[PDB]
């Protein structure tokens, strides 16, 4: 044949892959965690969005920390040979490095380790995307007026917010991040590379959103998401 390049992930396997959405809305009383109003808007948006990208979407609601770990374990032990990629979406309370089951926390590193290059072989070399709508701390942004491959390779963490910061969720419209994510995937998934889509998501969140609160502490605050990429190639959701 003629000259061949290689800087984009192969996305023309028979299946695009799984999209696991963990939607945690109601939390055991003993945890002391509030209900996450509007998260169902988010779960439903994501479901539709990723359906249109031809992912096999599985929605899960209100999982204990035990259920989260066993679900991720089981999904990682499936044969993904015919799938191009893996996507997992976490919607819950959180803190830096941490996501909450309905009855207590889960180390994010525990969840993602299941999918390490050496531990999930049918996903080695393929993009593993973790999209996390959850707090990474309690800081507020007050804004300003304007072997042979690493086992950690081929991961992408699309964080809703900067390290150390709260993440904002609107109980009517859904979270700022997920709203913006789905809109940008809708409009640009058939033409832009994923990092450039996520960059549009950064700008949308940074520019179009600002908290309104009766509490001065939480009023007029801003948010910037955080793209953490360990990808080794460009990711286009379409192929030719």
């Amino acid at each position: 044949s003629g000259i061949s390049l290689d800087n984009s992930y192969k996305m023309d396997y028979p299946e695009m892959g799984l999209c696991i959405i963990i939607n945690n809305k109601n939390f055991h009383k003993s945890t002391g965690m509030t209900s996450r109003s509007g998260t169902d808007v988010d779960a439903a948006n994501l479901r539709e969005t990723f359906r249109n990208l031809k992912y096999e979407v599985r929605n899960k609601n209100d999982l204990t920390r035990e259920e989260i770990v066993e679900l991720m374990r089981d999904v990682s032990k499936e044969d993904h040979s015919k799938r191009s990629s893996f996507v997992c979406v976490l919607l819950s309370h959180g803190e830096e490095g941490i996501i909450f089951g309905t009855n207590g926390p889960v180390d994010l590193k525990k969840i993602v380790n299941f999918f390490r290059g050496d531990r999930c072989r049918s996903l080695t070399g393929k993009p593993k995307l973790f999209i996390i709508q959850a707090c990474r701390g309690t800081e507020l942004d007050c804004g300003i007026e304007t072997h042979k491959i690493p086992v950690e390779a081929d991961f992408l963490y699309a964080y809703s917010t900067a390290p150390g910061y709260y993440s904002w969720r609107n109980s009517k419209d859904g979270s700022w991040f997920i709203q913006s994510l789905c809109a940008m995937l809708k409009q640009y998934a058939d033409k832009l590379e994923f990092m450039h889509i996520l960059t549009r998501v950064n700008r949308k969140v940074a520019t179009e959103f600002e908290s309104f609160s009766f509490d001065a502490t939480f009023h007029a605050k801003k948010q910037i998401p955080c793209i953490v990429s360990m990808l080794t190639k460009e990711l286009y959701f379409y192929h030719l």
């Binding site: 904002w168 969720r169 609107n170």
Partner: peptide
């Protein structure tokens, strides 16, 4: 608006 609420925080997660």
């Amino acid at each position: 608006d609420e925080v997660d």
